[PDB]
Amino acid sequence: GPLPDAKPLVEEATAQTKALKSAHMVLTVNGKIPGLSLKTLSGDLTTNPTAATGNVKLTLGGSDIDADFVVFDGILYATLTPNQWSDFGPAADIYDPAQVLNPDTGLANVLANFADAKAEGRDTINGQNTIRISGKVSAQAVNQIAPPFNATQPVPATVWIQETGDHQLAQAQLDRGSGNSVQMTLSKWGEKVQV
Numbered sequence: 637g638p639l640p641d642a643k644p645l646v647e648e649a650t651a652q653t654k655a656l657k658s659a660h661m662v663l664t665v666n667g668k669i670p671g672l673s674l675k676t677l678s679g680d681l682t683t684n685p686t687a688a689t690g691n692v693k694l695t696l697g698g699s700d701i702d703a704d705f706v707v708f709d710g711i712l713y714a715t716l717t718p719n720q721w722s723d724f725g726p727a728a729d730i731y732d733p734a735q736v737l738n739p740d741t742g743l744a745n746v747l748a749n750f751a752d753a754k755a756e757g758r759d760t761i762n763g764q765n766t767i768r769i770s771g772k773v774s775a776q777a778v779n780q781i782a783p784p785f786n787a788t789q790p791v792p793a794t795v796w797i798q799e800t801g802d803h804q805l806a807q808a809q810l811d812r813g814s815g816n817s818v819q820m821t822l823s824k825w826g827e828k829v830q831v
C-alpha cells in the first residue's frame with residue numbers, strides 16, 4: 637500500500653543496529669573499487685569478543701582466490717591453499733571485522749549519517765518484507781566503515797529495513813558511480829558464532 641515514512645524507520649534501525657552483537661553477512665563488490673581487491677564474502681561475525689568465520693573470493697596479483705577465513709583472538713587466518721591455514725597476523729592491520737558492528741563507526745554510524753532518506757519501494761530480502769530507502773551517506777561515515785572508498789563527498793546509498801518486527805537493517809549499498817558499488821546483506825541477528 638502506502639509506504640511508511642523513511643525517517644523513523646531509519647532511526648529505529650539505527651537503534652537496533654547499535655545493540656547488535658552478531659550477524660551473518662554477505663558482502664558483494666560490484667564493478668571495481670581501487671584498493672579493494674575483494675569480490676564476494678559470506679561469513680558470520682560476533683563481537684565482544686570479536687570472532688568471525690566464513691569464505692572470501694578475492695583477487696591476488698590478478699588471480700581470483702577462493703579462501704576460507706577465521707578471525708580469532710585478534711588474528712586473521714585463511715586457507716589460500718585448500719585445507720592449509722596460514723596466519724596473516726593481527727586482523728586489524730588489514731581490516732578488523734568488528735568495525736562493521738561498532739556502534740560509533742560501523743553500520744549504525746552509516747545509518748546515523750544517512751541524509752535525505754526517502755522510501756522508494758518494497759522488496760523481499762531473505763524471505764522478509766523490507767522497505768527500500770534512498771539517501772546519501774556522509775563521506776566521513778563511508779570512509780570509516782570502508783576506507784578504500786576515499787570519499788570526499790556524500791555517497792549515494794540504498795538501505796533496506798525490515799518493514800515490521802525489529803526493523804533491522806537487512807541490506808545496504810554504497811554507490812561509487814560508474815557501475816561500481818559495495819553491498820552488504822545482513823541476517824541471523826544474534827546468532828551464536830563458534831569459530
Ligand SMILES: CCCCCCCCCCCCCCC[C@@H](O)O[C@H](CO[C@H](O)CCCCCCCC[C@@H](C)CCCCCCCC)COP(=O)(O)O[C@H]1[C@H](O[C@@H]2O[C@@H](CO)[C@H](O)[C@H](O)[C@@H]2O)[C@H](O)[C@H](O)[C@@H](O)[C@@H]1O[C@H]1O[C@@H](CO[C@@H](O)CCCCCCCCCCCCCCC)[C@@H](O)[C@H](O)[C@@H]1O
Binds near residue numbers: 680
Ligand atoms: C562481513 C564480515 C566482517 C568482515 C568485513 C569485510 C572486511 C573484508 C576485508 C578484506 C580485505 C582483504 C584484502 C587484503 C589485501 C592486502 O593487500 O591488504 C594489505 C596488504 O596486506 C598484505 O598484503 C597481506 C598479505 C597479502 C594478501 C592478504 C592475505 C590473504 C588474507 C585475506 C585476503 C584472506 C581472507 C580475507 C577476509 C578477511 C575478512 C576479515 C573479517 C594490507 O597491508 P598492511 O597490513 O601493511 O596494511 C596497511 C598499513 O597500515 C597499517 O596500519 C598501521 C596503523 O598505524 C599499522 O602501524 C600497521 O603497521 C600498518 O601500517 C600501511 O599503513 C600501508 O600504508 C597500507 O598500504 C597497508 O596495506 C594497504 O595496502 C592496500 C592493499 O589493497 C589491496 O591489496 C586490497 C586491500 C583491502 C583492504 C580494504 C578492507 C576491506 C574494506 C571493508 C568493506 C566493508 C563493507 C561495509 C559494508 C558497506 C590498501 O588497499 C589497504 O589500505 C591496505 O591496508
